[model samples]
Target chain A: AGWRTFFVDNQVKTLISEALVNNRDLRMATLKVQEARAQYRLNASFDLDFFGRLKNMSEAERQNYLATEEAQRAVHILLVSNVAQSYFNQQLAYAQLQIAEETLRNYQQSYAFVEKQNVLALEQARGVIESTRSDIAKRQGELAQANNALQLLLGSYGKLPQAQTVNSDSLQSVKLPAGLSSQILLQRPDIMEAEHALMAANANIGAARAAFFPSISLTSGISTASSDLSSLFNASSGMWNFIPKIEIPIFNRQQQSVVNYEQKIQNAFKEVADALALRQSLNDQISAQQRYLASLQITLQRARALYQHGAVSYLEVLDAERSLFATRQTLLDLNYARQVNEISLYTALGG
Target chain B: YQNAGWRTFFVDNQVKTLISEALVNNRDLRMATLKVQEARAQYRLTDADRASFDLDFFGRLKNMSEAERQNYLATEEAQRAVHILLVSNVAQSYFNQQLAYAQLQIAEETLRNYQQSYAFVEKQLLTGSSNVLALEQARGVIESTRSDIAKRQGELAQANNALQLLLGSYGKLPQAQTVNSDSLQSVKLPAGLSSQILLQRPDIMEAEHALMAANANIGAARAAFFPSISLTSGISTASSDLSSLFNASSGMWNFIPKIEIPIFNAGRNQANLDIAEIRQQQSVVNYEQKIQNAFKEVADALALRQSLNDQISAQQRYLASLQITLQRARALYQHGAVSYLEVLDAERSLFATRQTLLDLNYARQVNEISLYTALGGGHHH
Candidate 1:
């Protein structure tokens, strides 16, 4: 929910809420935790041992319960991040869809300007109109594809909120820190889960090592046995039995069960580093893109004005327009990427 | 000039009509449709044409059936791939023809300009002021433009040949009347596409089927080694079984049933099993390489879009500056402040720049068509 709030878009928030309720993978991850809870509830009493195998195993199950919950939250963080970025992706597509909109009117306007001047031919205008229109029918299709792209983490919320008819500058940027600390990564769910899991792992090692010593299992039962039909509940005809057996470790298993923890401890650090790396670059990237976009717009505005005064042709204005459009799209790309990096940083930080 | 174009929603009306004509009459599309008919016929009862793949224990049976189904659908994908290629080809060929006609017109107009200069120079010589070499130079430019027209005319004819072949038509093809002859009248930009998954190209699917079919063969190969007895049957008009083969009336008898086990066959079956395994591996390599190559072409086209658009903008901007330069050159020459050759040089540079820009526009169209064709049919749905 915090992740959804982080984005300013209501459509993104709605999509995130729907996914949280109905996403198949996130639901499966949650169910896995319930299974761990069920498995932890399974235990026994008929065994008495100085080796402490059962005691250690019970502790291991306790650690597993804690670890599994942490893991589930880790998945929750990941899914939240996924939906956030996907929303950004959809926004990028939505903006691009609008861009698919350069129409024949612009071409026609240029033609009309030139025609009254009698410097251009009618056939030339016709060809230019046709060329500008070539993109018309296909734009709707690409947008459809853009809309269709949400099926993986998508839900059956038939009324998917429509994005507003907004321009490229709709997405806002923030000034998050360019660098991050390792301490922040420690709060990551997977990192905390891994430590708790390793606690279980080490506990399991104790049980496995305990198996090297002999374990005594005492089996006892008390029951009333009577030949007379009504004597079944009578204390005079009762039976009691006690049996004992000792198990000595015979075979199986390895040291690999413990060695992997060291390797995995190093892995979460990369996730932290990777997350911040993207986050840091996005700041520089956004400014450079904005600078480019502003200048392109300035050029376009001046070119249009110049053409109005007959100091330049409408063709030059078209060139400036092209430059502006490309810069806007590139800026949209950077903006989309910036939001995603923030998402990655959020997921990497875990809280 | 139309924003130097990226696949535009801007199909020229002439391109629309021409593309529409080709869709019905193009031999390639027609042949592709014919194959689909034949494929439907063969895949009729199989029902696996669309269902794709399946699996069993360690998945031998599953993979075997899976390959069959996948290979079956690959046929459908291949036909669709053929359709994309045909359409792209027709679009590109039509544009090439358009470009040629435009270049021819450029030359014709230029030839007229030179003819006027030659007439003026010849008249000036009678006044005993203009040199003989000046008249010669004017005629020289006229013949040069005439040669350019001849070359463009040849190209236009060739473009017609390629375009008509795609359309399967020769009905006094209407000359396209475009608003700007230099404008990329047919190039349509693929809009709103980003890192979106390209719809699976039919060729890639077909290659996968080749691998899957090989995988399925492994199931049959494994079964072959496990088999001890073989089943067979024969039919004839007269006798039914080998039990009656020795009867006096049994000359044309057929075996009703047969079962046999071969103890040894010099590794014929073993060689086949080995072949199937090796072929599966070979298919795996081939399948991956095909996708690898496909991605490069896809990446190539996408990268080209960014560069080509930038290149186009720069080219147009260059032309804009040159137009101003030409105006300056003309003013200075008219006032006799510069050599007469300076205006001719200005015109030459500007004319050549226009041609180059047109070529680049055509290239942009070809680039967009190539991108869509390579990406396959995801855009339509």
Candidate 2:
């Protein structure tokens, strides 16, 4: 319930719907699902005689159809997650840009104040100003790049008129649940696709095993032959025949196919295990990063107080600031990672 | 000419040979070359559109109706930009690989120094001369240095992979030999040069071409306001028997001429003209912005180079001072004039100073590469 509640924002829902409709990859996947469904239907509706045996490959095609549909759902989940993540990144970049600008302004003010003071202080402040200016430029570049990326995700050719608004408070407290089970991996589209592939492989093995027996087919036909069209429809010229045929396989690769099918099943299970392991790791990482950010904030406050009392040098204060800045950035990255993991978890759960 | 500029920096024959192989095999460059070919083909089609007549065997196919064709010159300019980017990227990646190697060397040396220090501290502890805390601190330094070495190794591996990708190679990339720091050099630029240098820059030139294409597109759109005429003529013969198919009596010939006047269509033609004009204006702005950005890049690179030169000198002096300080602290510790912590602190400072010096050296080299490319040296090749 909480995971569902997390994505209840109207803006996020709108963006997700737009992305589902407009994202080129998702659209292509949707088309593929339709094609797969049509192919499965065609297979189910038709049976053709091949090598004196009536053959219908609908069972394998049905598995393929299910896999395709799951793949489309996977793409849909990915599109939604990607749009949300990119939007979040845009917000992060925007925040960083603001911080960079403020830092630059603060350094500039400090430089002005120090110019009239000691030469050593003046030089230090000037250096800080230049580096801070450079940092601001870098941050601006990042912001612009992020905006462009978000616009592209929204299917726009150029920058949007305004940046998308994000609620930072809402983002800060993403209600991620604990104790997810490995069984949830069955819902993941990749695992389902793999399972379907295994099923198709099994179906192929069945068909191959059937090939080991003598193939039996029945045929009935009515035909007429005449030298001239005038007498082509004469009842006396018509003929009817019924025939049954059988063919036995001398040597075949059915056994080898069955071996390959068994290997596929093994590989499918490995994929599920890998996904589970990743989910477990991400859960731990998100918790650790949150604690790290909390401690860094406390350290920054202490460093500032020490500098104000002349107990530490300005460089010490600057060091604290740098550390805090880096930690905050890393925290933002971790938050995004956690959200993406949630998306992956949802995708892994299959839709 | 551009190749010579690159040669001055990549003094090693191995590096030079790698660049040559990359030029031939790089996937990005290949894709760019293909784009150029495609653009040229498109330009030919547009040129054909400008022709007054087209001759063909089929009657309906011969009578071609004229429609507004896009100006392919923009694509041509885009291809030129891609070409320039590929050459510049290869040069930058090569320089970066060398830098990564230098960093790796520094990291390894630092780790070695820390390991030797740790061993000394371990011996001291066994002799009951050094405290457990000092030995533990030494071990910590060694472990951290080892992690730094691993980090540099990872960076080197990633740099190698980047180069391999640019060279379109798979598996392990060729290991770059140690680069002599002195071999790295900066390119020369004339002081107070005219804006003509900016004109030569591929991106600036590309923008200019784009502007020209947009201007041409405006003309094409304006031409839509007038009428178009097409002429069609054909001769054919048909007969029941193959022998008489080409007979004079069985032959038929006809000529037809048609004209299409632009009628009212809810101002669609006017709207197209408006779009074309706006795009032309946008292109003009884009061209100006490209020139401004190029100037900024060159200026920034030059400024960075000046600062880095000063930093290199200052760091060298700092490193030398740290070395003396470490020696003094160690001598004092030996005589029991100061605590072991002082010696450890001096050693850590010296190690950090050396690492900073190495980083400065790498930065200086990268700055030179940036300057060279900013000056359009990559286009000379």
Candidate 3:
């Protein structure tokens, strides 16, 4: 996860790199690696593998150890996806902010000399001006939430990056290679974790075959209330449980291991099949949604133009503007969804 | 569509007429209300496709088909939830328009009172028919009254516009009914109901169906543990020429038996069973979550009913007292050294209280309707 996640072709301008430096998830996952290393090295002296029965399982066990690191990679990519989604949201708010500000000013200007009516009509004009006051405050609040929401996930809240702007080319992925029909879902950490575990399962099959032998796990507790690093690992400063946890299997399980092997490969197949299913429907939906969004934009443009020509009501224009604003946000959400799907696809490939 | 319960509460033919017309003509309702049919048809489609006669010797295909059917039922329940949404939505539109009309009426009546005073002050100022210094201040009240009346019309216009949309360019539907204390007081609450009432709620039904679907999936997973036996038999010909395929001498009848003994699946079969069982457990939690959610909503409506009615009653009593003060203030205006501002203050306060009380009355009606809807009693045709 350290730099493995950033190596993906779709670069969010070093956004994940920022997360790597400060993210609490990445930190804990790193600590998890250190935690597993403690147990691994402790068992390193036991010569469990030199006995040849543990050969397949030693490597099998190591695959699980590495899968934890892949687990770290999993959290990193999801966090990165979330940050990208929030970025688009903030961008949407900024665009909406501009529209609200302009609308407020236009209302104020239109009210300036339109006092040419009954006492009732005079105040009605004021209502138009006053309505935008609340609108501005509401839009500002949306912008605030969007900006800080992204920043909070970046582990850099309160002061947002001023350099943030519209996505110029952020939406598309780096192009796929020749005959890319070969599914990419296999690369996701989610995918790799399984396949690696499949390897571990096969390893276990051999281990079980040889178990023609042996395994241990469960607990120890200690108090280091006022102790230093020196006292932390010392036996007297802690408590250890010397439980011998194996009571059971063999070619009995050599057969069971092959049987056990079926569960994982089937799982990997299930996940990839699901992705293939998503491709057709999800892509179709995105295409239709983009078309819908395009129609709304045109409708907004026409509504505004006609209102200026006195051919439509301000209400219609307002409705049109509101529709366009909402559609923009909808399209952004849809784009982010597709982006996340692509992330899912990559993740399936063994990220 | 008859809305017998709503008709009983409203006691107004005009209210029924609006509700009935909207049930047919409401654009959004008809548009989205067809969604259940769409999902229902899809369910039927999948149910039909599961008929390809591949022998399910291990019950795999059979249980999978059952799971598929149950998911459809869950989807169907989810779609039907819009019944309550549409009925309450259209019903509330009518009631909201009633509130708007009340606001309009209050503005007109207040305008009359102020204009009457302004006219009196004008007569006095020009021809010695009224007081001197109070004429301009009276003018101030009349102008502002004119302004307020326009805003009230604006609100009324918007409210009517909403109803028009729901009525779909209506022909026969009249506008929302007029306000009267008789209409307001007719809605009455009854005593306790049981929690099983929520089982009638569509969302809970949806979750229950989902749980059943998840349970069926475990059956398919369990089927994997047993040997899959496939029946195999065929008629064959060994002749190389296609034209000789029917020759009796070249023909042979063959029967083959195929059985899969799952010796060591490396725990795959067990894991699948474990997966589906866990999902089944997850579905149980989701169902309970839905039940509690429905309970929370019904509790909210019931909790508000008592207090909301009390609020309307207290508001009505308060408005009555304000009206009495206004009447007394008017009576003392010419009898003693009572100030003109005092009379207007009483008028202003009375006017404001009448409008505020109308809102409380509207809210009380809404609370009753919402509670009925929450009870899963509301339905569309």
Candidate 4:
């Protein structure tokens, strides 16, 4: 539950929460939780009766218990991961929407100042009008789309409150968490899930080994009957029998030589290897995200410095505004990338 | 009467009837249905073994030896081992019934003890021998113990329900008397050298069965290397009179056998035989592994049983020591010689030690069953 909630400032929190609570994707994720739980229950509840008799049922009971426990654990982990991912995505959308609105307001001020100067020509006015109009439409569209995205994350189609902008300086002032370590990476749900898959593969090895053993099974049924309905339950009419059967595999159409038990063992080994590789990749992506965020901070600072010194035209400042906004958007995507990696890490760790 | 074998003893008893009931009622035992089918298939393979061993069909030019047949039979005998396991399951389940009964007894005793303790504590509190806090603690302990009892009781009920499925009927089972426990312990192990005896194991037999199946497939494949044969014959006596249908003059018998030999198969048969040999080799390895594992399983069970016995004994002693400590700690607290924390420590120790003891006992019971099952004989009718 803590993982699903955003770590953003209070202002961003309120905005993102309102948006995500009404999002369609979040609703879909909630539905998935229900579906997964139902599946877990069904697997847990299944019963196999041998003509409705068990002399001693300890082994069967053990199997049933194991199945039920695994099913419950699987569904629980999935629900937590889904909620976390969707919530994070909503926060990213809200951040991007704020950046767009700031850029739009700054451009609108520039257009107004240019119009106030009487020296502005018809062509210049036309230029300002067209640029401002397109800029306004673009900014409004982006903000609207971001709000819609929050609605989808919340699993509803509803309006969202605007995020109160903290000092824009704070955006570039983030202190990232300590460097990545294997132990920390292992805590991710994606890694945990993968480890569970590996465990399942281990169990499969046992099943395969057992497959080579002589199987003992029985199929028998008994019912009482008579031509006369009145005699159906009579002692003489009641009769039953059982046939205990044993089977040893003798031949296959493809012949026994082709049975590939080794393949299953190989498959299990590859799965574990794949999970480790994915975890390593996640670490690399996190480092990359940090670098990208830092780079954006430098670029944004440069744009502000040039504007303060008045070396570049105001139009150039607008260009810098657009560039800065693009960089912020990239930062949001990186945030999402890191969050998704965490989810995958949890799966790999067998949670 | 002594030489009549195990089945003769059950002739006059209701065991045959009980066995029949188990076949129809036991749910877990239904796993036997597939085994029986497999056994029948094995039996068919065994019947086919005489032909599969012969290399005469390979070619008139190629000669095979009696030693080759003996070598093949070594694996064939391994296949017969599956018949033994098919019966072991029913035998094991019969023993399981007794184990469940023993566990049920333990659950009932624990429940009774908890109930008695709760009543004793309540009486002590009313008489001002114990404080209200102590009374509340006792109540909490009683509630938890009651839940534990219910859980155990549920397990017992489920065990019986499973037994009913194995029996293939709905009637309650009669209290099971300990049957073959001692006799089985002293039962003579089968005589044979290691390699020979290894084939007696059912898992090895199944593996050997696959090898033979692979071997037969080689013949079938080699036959494809040659030709196919089919015989078709039909006779119809057109007699208007029904009485003449069986008459010698009106009856006719015809026999036709056709042989088709493959002139060339584009190397299909050669590839097939190669595949079959590869599979046979795989089965050989599998057979070897099963024998190795079976021996390991027996050794492991013996070790587990011995270890569990020692563990149980140690846990019992630990529990006893805790009980004494708890008594003395309570006395010390009442006399104002120690704080309530000391008493609490003793109480926690007693609870934990008791739980450990319970777990050890359960493990010991399970190990005893494991030892018997690993030995692999008796209980199957």
Candidate 5:
């Protein structure tokens, strides 16, 4: 299934494509992939040169090439996910900026009313306004930073043009596939890369072992040599030379190479385990965060009603607003994290 | 001399000790150190590649290389970068723990104030001086305040757990003692500190080294375009009889020089050269970007510190006014000039103001920590 299918917003889809086309890092990664592919072909051709057959190369080189190809796929997946996440971050920052602006306006109005009531209230109001203004400034800075980051990801120089707002409804109700199996994670490029790395390491042992045995090579040339330039190619003036040599290793480093390969396999297993653990934890956290956000929304509504009926003060309303704003921001961050982890899981599975 | 400079803000012996312990025991720091070791070992391997000749008993393997030597230098710089990162990370985490403790104290105090107000309202309602609405509102405030306390408790636990994680410990972490407010505000940046000082930063140094390595790789790539020359020389003993294979009389020595020219290979060499140039360009951009990012970080920290100081002072004045207002409101209620409701409202405002003040102080302390790290102060050790 296409990863973009999870996103319902056309704008988000367009941005993802734009980033994929323009992102410098992605372009560089693509270039690296091509380079690796070329190297693999070169290595394959080397086998044809030495053995006159494509299948005669060392096994280590074969596995190494496969590992490189898998790594390229990993980079592609990472690019897509990173672009999507950055887009989401920009949206979150914009939403937070809106909240901060609204909060400052409400506090300013409240400050005016409080300033007329008591000298003490006047001082408190002044402080609240100052604090709220600072908050707005901070949020504005964050928004600008987010905008710059997204623009950079899109490979645009300088400031971004006015961007479209996120389709919040779509983000609020993201649909993820159910019942993913652990085995699917084995398809992740990183896992595949690790597997290939192990295979390459194993093949390296073979090459290392081959080094311990006697290696033989032959060099021969036949050319005509004559004092007269006109008779240079005459058969009577033909000269031939042949050389065959053999060398045996007295102390090869094959054993150390074998040990290194074994260690690599162990490290690969650890990485797989780590990825599995992270996926499980992220899944649980996302679910819990969703529930928490829902509860916070309900609390905010109740608190707002209480303040309207004169049973609670504006302070209670402010408190509710602050808590809800914070919770919303956190929920958005967690959602982005969950999405990125999904990508990580896909990467782990060797996609 | 523990010239922790900005770390002097952590005058609390308990906090200082915690940071020291974390530096030694943090699993991530240990990993970073291991990464440094790994890089060093890789650098050594690359250094070996620069060796002009390798001698075996019967044969020699020889090659001329430049890229490997540059790569070794890059890795060495990377190791230093890790060291700086670990130090700054530890400092930031320690400051976070301090902030968390301060927040928890504020939350608890607020909760206590709400509880007292709730109880007073209930008593007033029993004597018909306060209505059920008043009692209900007080109850609501108490519940919200309790929730706030719970949130702060959770945050404190999180901060503690994070510090413990950095210290490589499991289970419950040690409770942090209250930080000295005076010391927290004592952190100061040196006057006339310039952005050029960032060049000494490990990350910038590392990026520059990476660029140098990539430059060397271009040289290696260009060298590949030329014909390669190699000498195959060996001394060996051979005989039809296996037992006399090692006899001195049977020994023979041979020498051969070979030259291989790349006239054509489907443009493989050209493609390799292009890739090398592209990588070099990428490295140059990366180096410049690192410097730009470092400068921004320092500037951002400085700006944040200024704003935080402004906020803290405003918050202090607001808190003082709220305290006086609470006292006056209680006196007016005793003189029957104001209703108990006014006193309750004043108390609520005071409670909120006190908490905000605490938060502002915490923000200031955190900003100081950021400035210290941004200024490259934590890497003194």
Candidate 6:
């Protein structure tokens, strides 16, 4: 690992400015903040300074504030996760593309050798070219798709310039965090989002339950009027008036806040359930991915041994190539899964 | 209203009852109907609030201006214009119900035929005369046919539910299935109309309504350029002299009026007007394009209906011819005049003709559904 250094004041300032202005995801997060602010302002009306205003005033205000807070949390988690996940996806895509290009070059060299056999051995050249062409097409599609995916994540142009080839040894050297499953919740952003959402729901339920009680609203207004603009502000130039109003609900209308509160409580239950389900699904997916990766490793080893012995046909070699290609894609998918889980965990933790 | 020829339109009473039943009983249709009601209520609510603000009597005399009055009126009219939108929603929902009904009926008939055929094919297979391939094909046919039956049943149930929702019924539909089929058949085409009638389609109606709403909003936005006026006045008794509070001198009256004129809001009002106009233009284009598509669909449906008739006739003739050829080939095979392969070829031809007939029937019904939906369903009644 690199040396751990404290961020200096200038560096902190730079980072803050970058987060506020330069970081694309952070910009999106700020827009979400603005949206949350708007929601908060909208809900401010629910405070109801005037009597007989906003029927479900307290509940509305509480829910609106909860929603605003939740939205802010969601934005924060999304930005952090996007920054982390996108980086991982880009790295994995680059690694996969490099492997594919290397494999393609190896196949190309083998193709040249097979072509030389065309004069001496027809069968060798014929099978090799046919299989190699199919293999080339598959790998080309793979590399293009990977590049396209990375470009999409980066939000860049659909096509990128050819990336310089690097060995797996260098790419794999980057240490994935240890005890990923155990520590994932601590680092994940999405878990924070989920936790904040649950908190919001919990606040909403409290607001709803408050609806069963009588809400006291008071309204008062004073106005002065005058014909002359010069005397408009004068004490004798206007008549002063004041009114105080009070309201109490005697009959139950269908719009009783208690019913709404109950519904919201149920909806919150659903949200928590959904969060739990997602976490469980992620766990299952990661477990499945590990098993699949192990199986693919064995298959790759067997394929390489067969190739060295020249025991199997080149078509079988192409099959082996396809297996390795699939394993690499699966590896990339595993990283994406981990990222998604991390995001979920962060959201659940209310980061 | 009397001179509008509404009475002379030959409206069928039975179909009206059926439509009413559907409106009451069909859940999906009922939902659409409720949506229409909701839209109407919304429109009315907005319309009622044209001049929502009021100025005090004395203040009104001080600040009232022609432009201020005009602006308030314009804003009020804009909101009132939104009420027209409910008509389009009602029309769209009505048409969708008719389409569902037609498709459901066709499915039912197809299922009945397939059920009978399945029985016959199974009987033939049990006698060991039919090949295993034929038996397997028959099984596939029955399974596929069963799926269609299930699908149609679901559609019919949904259609009934929609109709019930439209009628604003709270409980289960009491008489959903009591549709007057004869009345539906008795429905006559409105006279002297070409493909232009397709423009009257519900989709076009909705688009036009949206365009009108947008246009009205533009006027509402433009009203912001003028001044807004409001007046408020109330009489109150003071408590310093409780006994004399009821005295005329103690009771005071006051009038307050306020006027707001837009000077410069960084082009906010201008931007609002621009947005309204743009939306109006977009809706206008959408309305026009919907009309074009509606016209094309009407034309297509009519053509398909006509073509399918000829196709059905041709297929019938072909089926009969193939049957005769198959019979002759079978006889010749029995008499050793022809090979079994020749008989098989004839049988294949007959099977193809039967399949064609089934497909043609389905096509004919689908074309009819398209035409009915294009005409805006029972709502046009």
- Tell how far residue A196 is off in model 1, in angstroms: 98
Model 2 chain B worst lDDT window (10 residues): B230-239
TM-score result, candidate 5: 0.37
Tens-digit per-residue lDDT, B202-264, candidate 1:
655655566556544433322322222211112111111212222333333222222143212
Candidate 2 vs candidate 3, TM-score winner: 3
List ranges where model 5 is wrong by over 4 Å.
Answer: A1-351, B1-14, B26-74, B77-81, B168-186, B215-279, B328-341, B377-381
Q: In order, what DockQ does each candidate have?
A: 0.00, 0.01, 0.00, 0.01, 0.01, 0.00
lDDT of 1 by residue, A1-351 (tens): 446545556666776676576543332323222222222134111011111332355534533543466645665665565555556655666666565455354565556667666333766876867665556534433333333333224422224335565544445543333332334544565446445554654444233323321122111121111122122123454321112122433122134433343333344433444444565576567778788888888888888789889999886787677667677777777776777666755665565
- Candidate 2 versus truth, CA RMSD in Å, comes to 34.9
lDDT of 6 by residue, A1-351 (tens): 000111112322232333334324322233222221222224111012111232235644533533454434444444443433333444555566566555555454455556654455546554654565456445444443333322222321223334433323222212222222222232222333333443444433233223322122111121111122112123554321212122433222233433443343333322323344444465566567667767877876787788789877555665566666666666566545544444443343334
- Listing candidates in order, what is each one's chain A TM-score? 0.58, 0.53, 0.50, 0.42, 0.55, 0.42
What is the Cα-based lDDT of residue A167 in candidate 2? 35
| Cα displacement (Å) at residue A189, model 2 | 83
What docking grade applies to model 4?
Answer: incorrect
Q: Write the per-residue lDDT of candidate 6 for residues B1-381, one digit (tens) a residue.
A: 211211222243433443444433433432342454443344244356661011121234237586764453344222222221222232333333444455555555555545555566567778865677876776786688678667655554554454444455453333323332212221234433333333345455556557556543323322332112111012111111221112233332121212244312233356577776677567755754665455445445545654566456545544544455556556645655444544443454454445555556545544444455554431132
Best by lDDT: 1
Tens digit per residue, CA lDDT, model 3, B1-381:
335545554445676676667666644433533432232233234356651001211132235575674454345553344445445555565676678778878888888778766766676678856566688788787788788778766666555655565556643535545655434453443322334445556656666666566643323322332112211112111111221112333432121223243212233356587776677667655754554445445545645765665455544544544455456556645654245645654566567767877877777767766665665653211
- iRMSD, all candidates: 33.1, 30.1, 33.3, 28.2, 30.0, 33.8
